[PDB]
Design a protein around this nucleic acid. Structure first.
Ligand SMILES: [Mg+2]
Ligand SMILES: [Mg+2]
Ligand SMILES: [Mg+2]
Ligand SMILES: [Mg+2]
Ligand SMILES: [Mg+2]
Ligand SMILES: [Mg+2]
Ligand SMILES: [Mg+2]
Ligand SMILES: [Mg+2]
Length: 1310
RNA sequence: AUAACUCAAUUUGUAAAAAAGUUUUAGAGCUAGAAAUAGCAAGUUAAAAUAAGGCUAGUCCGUUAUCAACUUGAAAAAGUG
DNA sequence: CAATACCACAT
DNA sequence: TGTGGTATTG
DNA sequence: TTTACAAATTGAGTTAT
């Protein structure tokens, strides 16, 4: 009798129930509660609205951050535990004064001076050591016995802020020396062409406070005849961290683009060295050393002979220069600009020095502020120099201190320890412990050090001790933990669920893939009558001769190196492979280079060992653990080979198990899968064939070897946002089925709807850096500007036209065109992968196909460079260069057209599968599923085109009815479509030359709805004779459906979860709004948190005390239970409320009111709950469809539409009138309404288009939900909010179901 | 539709770390003046917290997902037009 | 108890 | 971007 | 901000059921 339509969105689920003739039923639903109404008429159509589901990312970031905090705290505690006794001998309450430092003097139990406990000593301390780095340097250099408190402070400062762990190994803090060395190996390599490095201040030039490229040019400038693109230039460029290409230097065909910071460099340099010889290794190694020294120079900037604490010394340098420059600046301003002195050095709000030190002004804002001040005055040259160097008035605690490796802090710490262990025995006994505190870091593969109470943890214990940084290796089983870290996420074999999947880089796996590909290769010559398979001996010969000698095997190599060389074929045609074999024996060649023993790799005896080695290299990344793991094979290789093997690492896992590939044997033949791949007589059967061959036992053994709704949906691959919509739509379906007397629908039609700036800046920066372009220096940009499409494309294309090979102009983007690579008529693609910036789209070639072969031939190399720079992707490149591959065939066109209507997205198939499995649960006599309900999936294009073709227009901003309407139209169009063409069930319904005809078929699939294109008035199916669409009275029914005033729009009520409040840590203030950041931290003294989020409001009817005499006064109000107060409130509501000051609370009348709780008042006026003290608009404006269609037409053959607009231009006043009466009845914002009316009467002179487009904006005043601001024309109208929830307390509360069909109304008069 | 492989891109989930920021306190402000106020000096650093907190007491957990109302029922979850 | 202006997040 | 919290003004 | 890892998914290809 009925079908269901569904529109699944990220914030909405549209639903509709239709009958045989495409009508939606209306029904009487019972109404519960204590009101007058016992029932209500409802149309079976509506939409569920809900806030977006969130990812788990934020939660994760905060969790991990938390752990970082507690662990840092623990580091400090370990340090204090070590210092405890001796400190107790020295200062009885040092640590106590330290711990209560935050407390006000009134709350302190000890002296207010932390370090020493008295004024004179404290002042003396700060006098001698103005910064902590002074004390650090002092404790590093001096040999005098020092106060244990200062020692502690230094060690603790180094431990609390230890620096990163991005660099492995030890660091011993030079550039001149390694430069002279570089010149040395270079000149010793190139005897004929030497370089004069006399008088070349390499230290000052390379360690300069400038960009790497500029420094490169500066260095090259001192070298006559040497250019930056030359070899030495590329070496220095390597040391500076650029991306040089050593191809041009060594006459290579393979580009030697190598970046030092890139993780693949260590193998790239081997790939390069294998081509130019091993003589050049010294050179590049030198270059790397010089690079390390350069980075260290970036951090330190202080000579190493002066002190063993270059970092602290550098900070002290910052301090001294800050002092000198401050004195200078103050004097200068005193002399020349006396009026600006107060503004600069006294006002914290003006971003001057005062704002820079005491205010919230950053270093950048401060440099921005004094820039024209320094420019205007005289004697401020060097200050400007430092300002552009970002080296002026620098603090010691700065954003760019993230460069600091932990090794140097460790160096200072070790120095201080070695210095003071001469006087304190406990420092000698605890030296390595203290060092380990700073050093130790829980491995990422171990995870949280839990004991059975963490859902995130996985680590295994080797013992039951309390884990400390010192006993970590003994208590924690690092091996089992690291193994679990990977194995808990990796797939088992689908075919053999109890079998682990092989490493992707396994030798056996690679043999499998190579043989599997090779088996389906066929060849024909002049003498043969038919292409033949490769036999076993041929495959083995090809493997041994080609696959085991070449990294990659091309077709040319197959023909010439095998078919000519072994078979004596001058000509042969190959069918199995394209250009080159996709599969390869990469690991074989890696291990061949490492161990240098081919016979060892070819020996079948060593198979297990090699598999184990590759497994070790894959499963782990820690070189130490890898080394320990490979110890059993140390007797097989030399130590050098062992270290080379150590360096070798792999990532990633296969898809199949070893037992599948080469374990299970066929019962009759005794052959494994791989055995069949190597040799299978006449029929070279595939893995797919082997797996499904009834004459073999593989299928048998595999078949023999072989989660709630919420969990199932959660386990799907996709954004949680759409997943929420999926669960919701399933629940909606369930309820609709309940509504229809538990009768299942005939059909269910489902349709599924289709920061970044930083990523864009990153892509452009790395791309330009790869390209070695100057366009970024010449044309600087901000990430916010990259939101613009043409500008982003401009930078992605290096400021060049993508079709013509010419530069473009930034100021001329408005004149340029954004062309689609593959035409939008075939591919509805809006992404960058299909868009391109060109001067004129005419220059792309023909407008019917991919850019012409002419363009492809002109721009292939440029596109190659853009590809290698990651500025364009592989897909974009292939789409750009398709013309040389025949362009778009008619089959491709037909495919595109059918894909415009047929849903291929996996997530939608999952939705359809869920629904189908929930509705169809019965089997027939042949044990086959009975499909009572057909689940149809359509794309949005069908309904959209349907709306455009029959003028059932959609305007989203008018109300939320369009979701419901979309669902309805989905049901109608879908049911009609399958009824008209039952053959198309295979395409649209879930469950189990000619291309031109297919193209035209799918291009005119929706023609049966039209009367002329010339078709009959009544459309029916040919075989059944069943009428599918009556063009005379069906559109009428649809029109009546969309014109229906009442539509069940239901805003999902949700308890608010997440952060307690705003994260902002506000200064002290006299307000009860402030929340204590800790239990005993009175926010009036210490400041604290503000703006908490209400989890859900609560209706309280009780009595409160009034006046000095506390007279009990009966009250009824809404109390917002915050997220923080929630657990306490739910543990015992009565105690909570009574603690809030309420008395005699009516427990039974306590009503939980989550956000978006619906209330109805007098004139059908509705309000939703935004909070405990704010309301939202709860009504929908059911604007008549005539006005909607008119708005659509006016805001955007065409002449008839224009004539309709001009003939019905009186509709404007009518629409304004509708909005007006609706606003007077429901919105109740007369001021804003008056502003609207006035603004409308102001721009009555404006063209109809503009007035329509601006009338569109007016609906935000009447829109359901939170009030928002909107501009009519140039008149901005601020939102009028509802800052009082008092009126709701006497209104009628409406409890709605997911569909809103079942209601319980409670008259809050009590 | 499904499977394996190649290349690339995207998305989801997890772990270990870093640099800041903020907030109170500690860095004897000096004079003149009865008084606010006036002139000048000065500033770069540190401690501590970084969701309140919890019991399971771990170098653990605390911001995702999920949620009409009623009837039951401790609870889970069923039932109700 | 209006209009109304500012704030967050920025790791 | 939004929208609920907050203080200011009145 | 950095590093390490796994899984789907899309979509251009080779081979199959
Ligand atoms: Mg804590
Ligand atoms: Mg030169
Ligand atoms: Mg600071
Ligand atoms: Mg190929
Ligand atoms: Mg590995
Ligand atoms: Mg939630
Ligand atoms: Mg800080
Ligand atoms: Mg509801």
């Amino acid at each position: 009798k009925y079908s269901i339509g569904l529109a699944i969105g990220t914030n909405s689920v549209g639903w509709a129930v239709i009958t045989d003739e495409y009508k939606v039923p209306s029904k009487k639903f019972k109404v519960l509660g204590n009101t007058d109404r016992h029932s209500i008429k409802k149309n079976l159509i509506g939409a569920l609205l809900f806030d977006s589901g969130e990812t788990a990312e934020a939660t994760r970031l905060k969790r991990t951050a938390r752990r970082r905090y507690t662990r840092r705290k623990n580091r400090i505690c370990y340090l204090q535990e070590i210092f405890s006794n001796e400190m107790a001998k020295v200062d009885d309450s040092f640590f106590h004064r330290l711990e209560e430092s935050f407390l006000v003097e009134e709350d302190k139990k000890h002296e207010r001076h932390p370090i020493f406990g008295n004024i004179v000593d404290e002042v003396a301390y700060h006098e001698k050591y103005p910064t902590i780095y002074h004390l650090r340097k002092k404790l590093v250099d001096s040999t005098d016995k020092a106060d244990l408190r200062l020692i502690y402070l230094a060690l603790a400062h180094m431990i609390k802020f230890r620096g990163h762990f991005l660099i492995e190994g030890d660091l011993n803090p030079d550039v001149d020396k390694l430069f002279i060395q570089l010149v040395q190996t270079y000149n010793q390599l190139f005897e004929e062409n030497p370089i004069n490095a006399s008088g070349v201040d390499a230290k000052a030039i390379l360690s300069a406070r400038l960009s790497k490229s500029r420094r490169l040019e500066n260095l090259i400038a001192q070298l006559p005849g040497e250019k930056k693109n030359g070899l030495f230039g590329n070496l220095i460029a390597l040391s500076l961290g650029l991306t040089p290409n050593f191809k041009s230097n060594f006459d290579l065909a393979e580009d030697a683009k190598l970046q030092l910071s890139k993780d693949t460099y260590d193998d790239d340099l081997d790939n390069l060295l294998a081509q130019i010889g091993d003589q050049y290794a010294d050179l590049f190694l030198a270059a790397k050393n010089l690079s390390d020294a350069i980075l260290l120079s970036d951090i330190l900037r202080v000579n190493t002979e002066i002190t063993k604490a270059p970092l602290s010394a550098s900070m002290i340098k910052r301090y001294d220069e800050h002092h000198q420059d401050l004195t200078l600046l103050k004097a200068l301003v005193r002399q020349q600009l006396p009026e600006k002195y107060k503004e600069i050095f006294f006002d914290q709000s003006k971003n001057g020095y005062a704002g820079y030190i005491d205010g919230g002004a950053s270093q950048e804002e401060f440099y921005k502020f004094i820039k024209p001040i320094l420019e205007k005055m005289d004697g401020t040259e060097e200050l400007l120099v430092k300002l552009n160097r970002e080296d002026l008035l620098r603090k010691q605690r700065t954003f760019d201190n993230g460069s600091i490796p932990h090794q140097i802090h460790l160096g200072e710490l070790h120095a201080i320890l070695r210095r003071q262990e001469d006087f304190y025995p406990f420092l000698k006994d605890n030296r390595e412990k203290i060092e380990k505190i700073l050093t130790f870091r829980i491995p990422y593969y171990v995870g949280p050090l839990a004991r059975g109470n963490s859902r995130f943890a996985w680590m295994t214990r080797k013992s039951e001790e309390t884990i400390t940084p010192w006993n970590f290796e003994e208590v924690v089983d690092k091996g089992a933990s690291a193994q679990s870290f990977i194995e808990r996420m990796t797939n088992f074999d689908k075919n053999l669920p109890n079998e682990k999947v092989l490493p992707k880089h396994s030798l056996l796996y690679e043999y499998f893939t190579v043989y599997n590909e090779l088996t389906k290769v066929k060849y024909v010559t002049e003498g043969m009558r038919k292409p033949a398979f490769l036999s076993g001996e041929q495959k083995k010969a090809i493997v041994d001769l080609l696959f085991k000698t070449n990294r990659k095997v091309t077709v040319k190599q197959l023909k010439e190196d095998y078919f000519k060389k072994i078979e004596c074929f001058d000509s042969v045609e190959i069918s199995g492979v394209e250009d080159r074999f996709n599969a390869s024996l990469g690991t074989y060649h890696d291990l061949l280079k490492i161990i240098k023993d081919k016979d060892f790799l070819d020996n079948e005896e060593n198979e297990d060992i090699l598999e184990d080695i590759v497994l070790t290299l894959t499963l782990f990344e820690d070189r130490e653990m890898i080394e320990e793991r490979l110890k059993t094979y140390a007797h097989l290789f030399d130590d050098k080979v062992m270290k080379q093997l150590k360096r070798r690492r792999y990532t990633g896992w296969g898809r199949l198990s070893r037992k599948l590939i080469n374990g299970i044997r066929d019962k009759q033949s005794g052959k494994t899968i791989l055995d069949f791949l190597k040799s299978d007589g006449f029929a070279n059967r595939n893995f797919m064939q082997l797996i499904h061959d009834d004459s073999l036992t593989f299928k048998e053994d595999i078949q023999k070897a072989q989660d709630s709704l919420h969990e199932h949906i959660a386990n799907l691959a996709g954004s949680p946002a759409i997943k929420k919509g999926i669960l919701q739509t399933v629940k909606v379906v369930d309820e609709l089925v309940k509504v229809m007397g538990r009768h299942k629908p005939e059909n269910i039609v489902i349709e599924m709807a289709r920061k970044n700036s930083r990523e864009r800046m990153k892509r452009i920066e790395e791309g330009i850096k790869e390209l070695g372009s100057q366009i970024l220096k010449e044309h600087p940009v901000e990430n916010t500007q990259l939101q613009n499409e043409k500008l982003y494309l401009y930078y992605l294309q290096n400021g060049r036209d993508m079709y013509v090979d010419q530069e473009l102009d930034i100021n001329r983007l408005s004149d340029y065109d954004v062309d689609a690579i593959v035409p939008q008529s075939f591919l509805k693609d809006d992404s960058i992968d299909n868009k391109v910036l060109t001067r004129s789209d005419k220059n792309r070639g023909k407008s019917d196909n991919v850019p012409s072969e002419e363009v492809v031939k002109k721009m292939k190399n440029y596109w190659r460079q853009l590809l290698n720079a990651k500025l364009i992707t592989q897909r974009k490149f292939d789409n750009l260069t398709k013309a040389e591959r025949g362009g778009l065939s008619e089959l491709d066109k037909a495919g595109f057209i059918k894909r415009q209507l047929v849903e291929t997205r996996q997530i939608t198939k999952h939705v359809a599968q869920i629904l189908d499995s929930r509705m169809n649960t019965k089997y027939d006599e042949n044990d086959k599923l009975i499909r009572e309900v057909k689940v149809i999936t359509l794309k949005s294009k069908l309904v959209s085109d349907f709306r455009k073709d029959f003028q059932f227009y959609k305007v989203r901003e008018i109300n939320n009815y369009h979701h419901a309407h979309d669902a309805y139209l989905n049901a109608v169009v879908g049911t009609a479509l399958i009824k008209k063409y039952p053959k198309l069930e295979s395409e649209f319904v879930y469950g189990d030359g000619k291309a031109t005809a297919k193209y035209f078929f799918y291009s005119n699939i929706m023609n049966f709805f039209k009367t002329e294109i010339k078709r009959p008035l009544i459309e029916t199916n040919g075989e059944t004779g069943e009428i599918v669409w009556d063009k005379g009275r069906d559109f009428a029914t649809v029109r009546k459906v969309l014109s229906m005033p009442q539509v069940n729009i239901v805003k999902k009520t949700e308890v608010q979860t997440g952060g307690f409040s705003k994260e902002s840590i506000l200064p002290k203030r006299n307000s009860d709004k402030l929340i204590a950041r800790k239990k005993d931290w009175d926010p009036k003294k210490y400041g604290g948190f503000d703006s908490p989020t209400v989890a859900y409001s609560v209706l309280v009817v009780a009595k409160v005390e009034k006046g000095k005499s506390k007279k009990l006064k009966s009250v009824k109000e809404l109390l917002g239970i915050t997220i923080m107060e929630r657990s306490s409130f739910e543990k015992n509501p009565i105690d909570f409320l009574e603690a809030k000051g309420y008395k005699e609370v009516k427990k039974d009348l306590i009503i939980k009111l989550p956000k978006y709780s619906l209330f109805e008042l007098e004139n059908g006026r509705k309000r939703m709950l935004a909070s405990a003290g704010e309301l939202q608009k709860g009504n929908e404006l059911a604007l008549p469809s005539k006005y909607v269609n008119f708005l659509y037409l006016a805001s955007h053959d065409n002449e008839q539409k224009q004539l309709f607009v001009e003939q019905h231009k009186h509709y404007l006043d009518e629409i304004i009138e509708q909005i007006s009466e609706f606003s007077k009845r429901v919105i109740l914002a007369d001021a804003n309404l008056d502003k609207v009316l006035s603004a409308y009467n102001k721009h009555r002179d404006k063209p109809i288009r503009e007035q329509a487009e601006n009338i569109i904006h007016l609906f935000t005043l009447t829109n359901l939900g939170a009030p928002a601001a909107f501009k009519y024309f140039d008149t901005t109208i601020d939102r009028k909010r509802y800052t009082s929830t008092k009126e709701v307390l006497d209104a009628t509360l409406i409890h709605q179901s997911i569909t809103g069909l079942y209601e319980t109304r409670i008259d809050l008069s009590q």
